[PDB]
Amino acid sequence: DKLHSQANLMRLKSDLFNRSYPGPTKDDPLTVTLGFTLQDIVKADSSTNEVDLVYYEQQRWKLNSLMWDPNEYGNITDFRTSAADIWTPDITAYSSTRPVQVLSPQIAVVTHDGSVMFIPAQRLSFMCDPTGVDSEEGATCAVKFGSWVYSGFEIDLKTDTDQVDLSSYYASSKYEILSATQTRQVQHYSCCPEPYIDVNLVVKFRER
Amino acid sequence: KLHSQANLMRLKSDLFNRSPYPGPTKDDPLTVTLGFTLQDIVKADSSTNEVDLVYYEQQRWKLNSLMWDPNEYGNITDFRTSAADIWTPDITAYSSTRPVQVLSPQIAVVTHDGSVMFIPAQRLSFMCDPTGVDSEEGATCAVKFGSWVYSGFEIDLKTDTDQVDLSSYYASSKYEILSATQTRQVQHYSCCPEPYIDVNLVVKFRERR
Amino acid sequence: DDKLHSQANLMRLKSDLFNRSYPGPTKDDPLTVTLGFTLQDIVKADSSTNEVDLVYYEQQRWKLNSLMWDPNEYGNITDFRTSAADIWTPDITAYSSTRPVQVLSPQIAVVTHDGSVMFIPAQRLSFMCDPTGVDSEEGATCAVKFGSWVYSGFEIDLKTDTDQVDLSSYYASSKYEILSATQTRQVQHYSCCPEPYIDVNLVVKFRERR
Amino acid sequence: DKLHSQANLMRLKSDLFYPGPTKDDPLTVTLGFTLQDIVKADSSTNEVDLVYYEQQRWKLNSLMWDPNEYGNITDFRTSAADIWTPDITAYSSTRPVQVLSPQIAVVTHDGSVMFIPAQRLSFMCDPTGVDSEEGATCAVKFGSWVYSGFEIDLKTDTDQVDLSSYYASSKYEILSATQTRQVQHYSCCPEPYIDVNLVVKFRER
Amino acid sequence: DKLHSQANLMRLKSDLFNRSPMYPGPTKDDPLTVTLGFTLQDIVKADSSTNEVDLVYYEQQRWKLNSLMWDPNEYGNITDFRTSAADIWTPDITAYSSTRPVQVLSPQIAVVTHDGSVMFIPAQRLSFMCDPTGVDSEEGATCAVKFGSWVYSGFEIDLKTDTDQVDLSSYYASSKYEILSATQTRQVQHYSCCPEPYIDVNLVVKFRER
Ligand SMILES: N#C/N=C1\SCCN1Cc1ccc(Cl)nc1
Ligand SMILES: N#C/N=C1\SCCN1Cc1ccc(Cl)nc1
Ligand SMILES: N#C/N=C1\SCCN1Cc1ccc(Cl)nc1
Ligand SMILES: N#C/N=C1\SCCN1Cc1ccc(Cl)nc1
Ligand SMILES: [Mg+2]
Ligand SMILES: [Mg+2]
């Protein structure tokens, strides 16, 4: 039995990854759903106005080219796969000051309806003035995330909720979270006439 | 000696070329045994609440596809191989604050019964408030380790003991270990209804007197 | 059906362009790279080593005949996104960096049917800069040149659209405020070689926020 | 002539280009350390940083040739990626080692290989006493991570660390530095384990 | 005309690299001489707590291989070309007393000329063993660092300089440190492993606080 289930998977993957995705286009656009789970505000540097966050970001999208019929494949309904084997969106912070450091395995889950889920954990340094962190109202900082190169005509972004998930926030962090929201926005950049979509992460925090 | 080399090369070729591992599935789940050997608490940063640990993580699992009959291969009963040649579990700390730094060669040992042993040494920074480390009672912190992407239906975990191996702990570390335990736990994450399995490392420590 | 066809068309175009045939510019086939800087933040100024750290992105544009197509032969595809590894890109280098530049954006470019390419890397750069005076009304002045490391002005020319650095995305709560920032084309000569080399010199006047 | 020698070498390398040692086909690796500098001693974390190079030597039958079949080529330089190399590891490092020299080895026609990696290492070391006449003492063991003494034996030519290239203006002076082969057994396993223990006594210059 | 020039270049590069097995490096029977020369841009940092100094410089390297020769007449009168350093053999020039891996600051691209000669000019940031005691005095501090092939003896790789004077023409004028002198000198070394002599170029820099 088990030998055939392994074989059914190896076959599914072979069939998918070796019979045919060039990325989204204006004719074939994509919606990426984004959500943030903030784990820690590690460091706030008032000498450079950089703050370091640890969080994970749930990403979801769906491709017709990743679809299969589970009956054709021993009732496999989903699988884990290296993120290198598939297209992934180029979700980038707009005001980082250091390259993101990746903290989790680059492996995604693909489902038979063609939907993909990928949940990278990251440490990010970004532009933030923490003046006021030692006050009751705390400091407020914001960072936009979205595709670096795909306009709103190729990649649209959505959230499931405007509330950042704080259920895993580190109970003994140096900083407590007063509020954290994630909200879709439209931008234009100087290069191009097309609008570009971002999700803006806004965090209000203070010294515990 | 010529024959023995040829026998090993043949085995590896048979296993890695002439045979078809896409990872565990709900239909073919895997149990990984995990244990920790703590070598050093290097740094405890009270300004960011990060602690740095150096440890070895013993991983063991068994695959039917790695099995062979030693009698067919000159009585070879195990071999060393690059961790790149085989599947390995995506064991991840839940509350790291920086990418782990790998401190040992990425080489595993495969045995004829299909079992694999792999023992990466690593430096880890993780979320830990060291308040109390300057007192008799010390500081206590914890970090969970488990598959990032495979639920308990695909990867289960277990330990061989509740006690973290402290027999190699650095005798002149800045910190001494009061207790160190490792315990299987079940978690649920927002994305998904399935349970995810971890081994929780709980360490009580204080400044050396 | 339509979405299946558009994908097939793009895959086919990319196949035709990249699988079925550019060794860089030469004196017989030279190239112009238009450069523009958008300065986001002066992160740090270290007076103990005379290094300043900047975050910016750099818009780069050029055009190749080899990247041309008729949208009509490809379902009216007029442009596409592509990994920067799939195409030639110019070796634009800061002359007085003190650390390898850190890349902050995905290495992906946009290619248009007229053969034009746009690539906009975001970078954190440490460069040689004496911040003396930063604590004064007048501020400090530093400069860093950007150009091809290996291609002379006979192979790669540089152009700017304006001599003004784009400050519309400068971080409003940076430790440093920008008094002015200019980008100016220049010609240099190096010891190795008789040929002139082109650079764009970024000059930044800044002070501690007041 | 020069084109003939190029082709002779190209041919030798192609003709030559081993799954590692085993209980049945064990290997002895000779090790020797040359200490260049104690760069840093951090009393806040008990870490010390060393710069040194390590001479590694071993011999493989699979790497032998007759020079007369190859234009009297007696040795060649080769990328360490092209050959098997021993997984010699510090056992109490606190950072990944940093490689300071090209990963190229020399192979000789008798199948012997020489490889001399220079490295910066941070390792577990309490420097208490460095500011006194007696100085500080620290130790770090080096050995295979994955092979037991039944697969890889270690040999040294000397128990003296080579100090002839020690930086004369280092922040730290070396009082002594030894490298001692140790054989031991652990609770887990019947087979012997072999390491070379580097012991360094040093003090502020 | 331009399309022919590109075709000529890709043909030449295919004839040299694609239809020839990579040069196996120098040997006693086919030895090589590498010319080296340094251009010092900045002494960035001098750490008296560890006795490490950090230098930013570029290093011009030149060598010549018969296997890289062509007749420009067979190739549209192409007399030289830029190429990725990964396409060709390059010397393993290493500092003997570095304390961290070198950081590369320029694109790893070289120029190959039709006589088989190669020019490659890497910019690097190097930390090396140096006691800066006396940098705050009029006489300054003196440090030295040797460079050469880590693995090839003088029977395989010899070195030479064009001058014993380090090029100071691009030294950062507002560095924390001023250069009093900087020389580069060929030496013959013997290492413990081996009877053969090894060649280095010793860089000696005298410097003091600005
Ligand atoms: N949310 C969530 N899921 C998390 S956070 C800790 C690990 N996981 C499980 C998971 C599940 C699926 C994917 Cl693609 N990635 C991760
Ligand atoms: N200017 C500009 N464009 C920017 S800055 C933030 C992301 N973008 C959009 C973009 C558009 C095209 C390319 Cl090649 N790269 C980036
Ligand atoms: N000397 C010199 N040349 C320099 S320093 C800054 C860029 N250049 C031009 C150049 C020319 C050729 C090569 Cl191989 N490398 C660099
Ligand atoms: N000992 C020694 N040899 C050294 S230290 C500086 C460079 N060399 C020469 C060398 C010779 C051979 C090999 Cl494999 N590696 C290095
Ligand atoms: Mg909106
Ligand atoms: Mg070998």
Task: Judge whether A176 is annotated as a binding position.
Answer: no
Q: Note whether E60 contacts C: Cβ–Cβ < 8 A.
A: yes
D160 contacts chain E (CB < 8 A)? no
| D44 and chain B in contact, CB less than 8 A | yes
SS3 at position B84: helix
Contact B109, B86 (CB under 8 A): no
Tokens found for residue E61: 């390297």
For residues C200 and C158, the answer to whether their CB atoms sit within 8 Å is: yes
If you measure from the C-alpha of residue A182 to the centroid of ligand 5, how many angstroms do you get, rounded to a whole number?
11
Q: Are E192 and D164 in contact (CB under 8 A)?
A: yes
In 10 A of CB B99, how many CB atoms? 14
Distance, in Å, from the CA atom of E111 to the CA atom of C192, rounded to the nearest integer, reads 11
For residues D26 and D191, what is the distance between their CA atoms, to the nearest angstrom? 13
Q: Which residues of A touch B49 (CB under 8 A)?
A: 42, 170, 172-174
Q: Is B12 on the interface with D (CB under 8 A)?
A: yes
Measured between CA atoms, the residue of chain C closest to residue A89 is C106
Q: How far apart are CA A107 and CA A110, in angstroms?
A: 10
Residues from chain D that touch E98, judged by Cβ atoms under 8 A, are 51, 100, 118
C-alpha pair distances (Å), A68 with each of A75, A76, A178: 10, 9, 45
* Nearest atom (ligand 4) to Cα of E198: 9
Those residues whose C-beta lies under 8 Å from the C-beta of residue E118, and which sit 6 or more positions away, are E61, E62, E63, E64, E65, E68, E88, E90, E110, E111, E112
CB spacing of A103 vs B90 below 8 angstroms: no
C136 touches chain A (CB under 8 A): no
B23 in contact with chain A, both atoms CB, cutoff 8 A: yes
Residue type, D187: S
3-state class (DSSP) for residue C6: helix
Cα–Cα distance measured from residue A123 to residue A41, given in angstroms and rounded to the nearest whole number: 10
Amino acid identity at A86 = I
CA distance E119 to C192: 9
Which is the closest atom of ligand 1 to the Cα of A80? Answer: 14
Token pair of C37 as six digits: 């800087």
The experimental technique used to determine this model is: X-ray
Touch between chain C and chain B: 3 or more Cβ pairs under 8 Å:
no
Count of CB atoms situated within 10 Å of the CB of D24: 16
Q: Test B49 with A170 for CB contact under 8 angstroms.
A: yes
A189 CA distance to ligand 2 middle (Å):
7
How far off is chain A from B147, nearest CA to CA, in Å?
A: 9
Tokens 């090589």 belong to which residue? Answer: E32
Q: Which residue, chain included where needed, has tokens 């059914």?
A: A8
- The distance of E1 to chain D (nearest Cα, Å) reads 36
Picking from E49, E52, E97, the nearest residue to D36 by CB comes out as: E97
> Cα–Cα distances in Å, from E154 out to D106, D112, E8, E158?
15, 21, 38, 5
Q: What are chain C's partners, defined as 3 or more CB pairs within 8 angstroms?
A: A, E
Nearest to C108 by CA among C86, C124, C78: C86
Chain D meets chain C (3+ C-beta pairs below 8 A): no
- D135: CB partners within 8 A, 6+ apart: D129, D175, D201, D202, D203
A in contact with C (at least 3 C-beta pairs within 8 A): yes
- Closest Cα to residue A138, out of A163, A109, A173? A173
CA-wise closest residue to B168 among B33, B50, B53: B53
- Residue C190 Cβ contacting ligand 3 at under 6 Å: yes
Q: Are D56 and D144 in contact (CB under 8 A)?
A: no
- Gap between the Cα atoms of A42 and A125, Å rounded: 10
Q: Residue C18 has what DSSP assignment?
A: I
Q: Pick the residue from chain B with its C-alpha nearest to A57.
A: B191
Residue A103's contacts (CB-CB under 8 Å, 6 or more residues apart) are: A54, A56, A120, A121, A122, A123, B92, B96, B97, B98, B99
Q: Which residue of A has its CA nearest to B99?
A: A103
Is B49 within 8 Å of chain A by CB?
Answer: yes
Closest ligand 4 atom to Cα of E150 = 7
**Any idea which residue has 């008799």 for tokens?**
B136
Contacts of D82 in chain E (CB under 8 A): none
Distance of alpha carbon A126 from alpha carbon A112, whole angstroms = 37
Beta strand pairing status for A107-111 and A78-82? antiparallel
D191 is in an annotated binding site: yes
| Cβ atoms of residues A34 and A183 within 8 Å | no
Question: What does this entry list as its resolution, in Å?
Answer: 1.9
Q: How many domains does chain B have?
A: 1
> Is there a contact between B127 and A173 if contact means CB atoms under 8 Å apart?
yes
**Is the shortest distance between the CB of A205 and ligand 1 below 6 Å?**
no
Q: Which SS3 state, helix, strand or coil, does residue E18 take?
A: helix
Query: Token match 């790998």: residue?
Result: B102
**Residues in B 170-199 with any Cβ partner in A closer than 8 A:** 190-191
Residue D107 Cα to ligand 4 midpoint, Å, equals 13
Q: How many CA atoms lie within 13 A of E1 on its CB side?
A: 5
Are the beta carbons of E60 and C91 separated by less than 8 Å? Answer: no
Cβ C133 vs Cβ C154: under 8 Å: no
Q: Reduce the DSSP state of residue E75 to 3 states and report it.
A: helix
Strand order in the sheet with E198-209: E93-95, E141-149, E198-209, E177-189
Residues of B in contact with D99 (CB under 8 A): none
Distance CA A92, CA A89 (A): 9
DSSP assignment of D143-172: EESS--TTTEEEE-S-SB-B-TT--TT-SE
Q: Which of B9, B39, B101 sits opposite D96 (nearest CB)?
A: B101
Q: Which two tokens stand for residue A44?
A: 């706030």
Q: Is A186 in the pocket of ligand 2 (CB under 6 A)?
A: no
Contact: D124, B1; criterion CB under 8 Å: no
Provide long-range contacts, Cβ within 8 A and 24+ apart, for E87-90.
E87/E13, E87/E17, E88/E17, E88/E23, E88/E112, E88/E118, E89/E22, E89/E23, E89/E25, E89/E65, E90/E61, E90/E118, E90/E120
Alpha-carbon distance values, A204 to A41, A50, B97, B128, E67 (Å): 11, 15, 20, 22, 65
Q: Which residues of B touch D18 (CB under 8 A)?
A: 5
- The encoded tokens of residue C6 equal 């558009």
CA of C136 to the centre of ligand 5 (A): 42
| Cβ of B192 below 6 Å from ligand 1 | yes
Q: Please name every residue paired with E109 in a beta bridge, in sequence order, or none if there are none.
A: E84
C87 lines ligand 2 (CB under 6 A): no
Query: Best of E121, E124, E168 to mutate for ligand 3, by most ligand atoms within 8 A of CB?
Result: E121
* CATH label of the domain that carries residue C175: 2.70.170.10
Quote the domain boundaries for residue A149: 1-208
User: Could you tell me the sign of the dihedral formed by the alpha carbons of C142, C148, C151, C154, in that order?
Assistant: negative
- Does an H or E element contain E115, and which? strand E115-120
**Chain D residues with CB inside 8 Å of B109's CB?**
146
Shortest Cα–Cα distance, D147 to chain E (Å):
26
- Give the pairing of strands C197-208 and C140-148: antiparallel
Residue of D nearest to B43 (CA): D45
Q: Give yes or no for E11 touching C (CB within 8 A).
A: no
CA nearest to A49, candidates A125, A127, A123: A127
Query: Is ligand 4 within 6 A of the CB of residue E50?
Result: no
Q: Is A160 on the interface with B (CB under 8 A)?
A: no
- Residue keyed to tokens 């009877």: E195
B3 is in an annotated binding site: yes
3-state secondary structure of A182: strand
Provide Rg for chain B, Cα atoms. Answer: 20
- Which residue from B165, B195, B169 is spatially nearest to B36, judged by alpha carbons? B165
* Contact check, Cβ <8 Å, E66/D36: no
Among D55, D77, D157, which would you mutate to test the E interface (most chain E Cβ atoms within 10 Å of its Cβ)?
A: D77
C50-to-C9, C60, C145, C178, E126 alpha-carbon distances in Å? 53, 28, 17, 18, 17
Task: Compute the distance between CA of residue C190 and CA of residue B70 in angstroms, rounded to an integer.
Answer: 67
Within chain D, strands assigned E span 27-42, 47-64, 75-79, 88-90, 98-99, 104-108, 110-115, 118-124, 136-144, 152-155, 172-184, 193-204
| Inter-residue contact D181 to D194 (CB < 8 Å) | yes
Q: Is the CB of A148 under 6 A from ligand 2?
A: yes
- Cβ distance B38 to B166 under 8 Å? yes
Q: Whose CA is nearest to atom 8 of ligand 2?
A: A148
Of the candidates C24, C99, C192, which has its C-beta nearest E82's C-beta? C24
Residue D179 CA to residue D182 CA, distance in Å, equals: 10
Q: What six digits make up the tokens of C85?
A: 């590894």
d(CA B99, CA B83): 19
